[PDB]
Amino acid sequence: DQICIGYHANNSTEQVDTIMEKNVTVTHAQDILEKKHNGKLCDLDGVKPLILRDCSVAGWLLGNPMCDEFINVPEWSYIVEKANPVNDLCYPGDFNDYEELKHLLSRINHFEKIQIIPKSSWSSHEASLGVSSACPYQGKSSFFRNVVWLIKKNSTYPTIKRSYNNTNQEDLLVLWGIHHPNDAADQTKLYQNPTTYISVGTSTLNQRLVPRIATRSKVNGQSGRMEFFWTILKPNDAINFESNGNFIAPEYAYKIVKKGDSTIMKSELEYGNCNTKCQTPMGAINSSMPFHNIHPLTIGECPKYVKSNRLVLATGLRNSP
C-alpha cells in the first residue's frame, strides 16, 4: 500500500521564458500582449474622424477650392492627414507658425465657421478679381475661399482701416495673408502703390508686414508668394487691420466650439466604416490585454504600447512530457 505526492500535467504546449531558461512548457499561461489590429480607420466611441484625404490642415483652414468637402465639418474625434497631401497651398507660399497651429488643433474637436468681413463690404477696392490659375475650381481660376485677394478699384488703392471685435463667447481663429509679388511692375498692376504695408493689431498682437519683392522659381506656374498668418482672438477683443496693398483679407473666421482630446495622425488609409474604442494610425484595437505592440501613437482607451514580439506570463507549472 502506497501514497504519493504529485502534481498536474496536461497536453498544453504553451511556452514561457525565464532568465535561466527559455521555451519552458507550462500547463497554463497568460498572454498579455495584443498583436492584432483590424487595419482600418474607425469611429472613436461612435464619433467619426475628420479624414482629409488629399487635403492638408493648411488647405482645409484657408479654404483651398479643392477642399470643398470640408467647407462645413461636424465634431470630430481625431484628425487624419496623409504624409504628403497634394492639396495644400495651391498658390505657393508659407503658413506662419504652422506647427504651433496644428498643435492647437490637437486640443480642439469642433470648429464653426463664421463670416467676419463680408465680400460685399469692400467699397473702395475690387474683391472679385483676386483669383489665380494656381488655384483652379471647375476649370476656372479661383482662390482660397476663406480669405479675399483685394485689388485696386479703377486704378486706386485707398488705405484700408478695418476693425472686428468678437462679440462671440468663444475664441476665434482669424486667418489672413500677404502677397509677395516678383517685380515692381506687378506691384503697380495689382495694387498701384509701390511701397506698402499691412498692420495687424489685437490686445496682444502688434504686427506690421512688408512685402518682399524678388524674382523666384515658378512653383505651380507661379513666382508670386502668399504668406499666411493667424491669431487667436479672445472674446471682447478687437482685431484692427490697416493696409494700402498686398492684403489678403479675412472673409471667414473659425469659432472654436469644443475643446477635447484629439490628435492629427499620419495615415495613408481611408475610412473603414467601423467603430472602435482604441485607434492607431495602422488600424483599430479591440482587446482587454494590458499591452499591445501595434503603434506608439494611439487615441482612446488603449493598452500600453511596448516594442515586444511576445509577453507571456506563466500561471501554471512546468509541464512534463
Binding site: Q2, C4, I32, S106, R318
Partner: protein, 158 residues
C-alpha cells in the same frame, strides 16, 4: 527547480489529476486513484492571480507618445523629440520584458515550493509508519485502506 520537487525527485506530472495543481495518488487492495489537495491548490490560485493583477496594475502608468510636428529648420528639436519618445518606449519595453522573465521564474519556483511543502507535511505524519521511497511515494508498513488513506490527506493520521 530551486525546491527540488517538480522534475526533481518527483520525475513528472500526472495527466490523471485534472482536479487541482497538487495532490495525492493512493494504491491499495481496494484500488487506486487521484485526489487534489484543495487547500494548497487554492492558495496557489490566489497567489498567482494576485501576482498577475499586480503586474498589470504596476504597468498601467507607462509613457504615452504624442504627435508633434516641426518645420525644416527645427531639426534639432524634432530629433530631441524623437530620441525622448523612443527613449521612454525602450525603458518601458525593458521594464515589461524583464518583469515577465523574473516573475515567470518565481512562479515556477512557487509551484515547486508548494509541492515540496505538501510532500514534507505528509512525511512528518507518516514518520516510521512508512518507507520513504525516494520518488514522491511512501510505502506503508501495515495495510492501509481507503479511510486510512483519507486520513493522510486530511491531516489526521497516526
Amino acid at each position: 527547480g530551486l525546491f527540488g520537487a517538480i522534475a526533481g525527485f518527483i520525475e513528472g506530472g500526472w495527466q490523471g489529476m485534472v482536479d487541482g495543481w497538487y495532490g495525492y495518488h493512493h494504491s491499495n487492495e481496494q484500488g487506486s486513484g487521484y485526489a487534489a489537495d484543495k487547500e494548497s491548490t487554492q492558495k496557489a490560485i490566489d497567489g498567482v492571480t494576485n501576482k498577475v493583477n499586480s503586474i498589470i496594475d504596476k504597468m498601467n502608468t507607462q509613457f504615452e507618445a504624442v504627435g508633434r510636428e516641426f518645420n525644416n529648420l527645427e531639426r534639432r528639436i524634432e530629433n530631441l523629440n524623437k530620441k525622448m519618445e523612443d527613449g521612454f518606449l525602450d525603458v518601458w519595453t525593458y521594464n515589461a520584458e524583464l518583469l515577465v522573465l523574473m516573475e515567470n521564474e518565481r512562479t515556477l519556483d512557487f509551484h515547486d515550493s508548494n509541492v515540496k511543502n505538501l510532500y514534507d507535511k505528509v512525511r512528518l505524519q507518516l514518520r516510521d509508519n512508512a518507507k520513504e521511497l525516494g520518488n514522491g511515494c511512501f510505502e506503508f508498513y501495515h495495510k492501509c485502506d481507503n479511510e486510512c488513506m483519507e486520513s493522510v490527506r486530511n491531516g489526521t493520521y497516526d
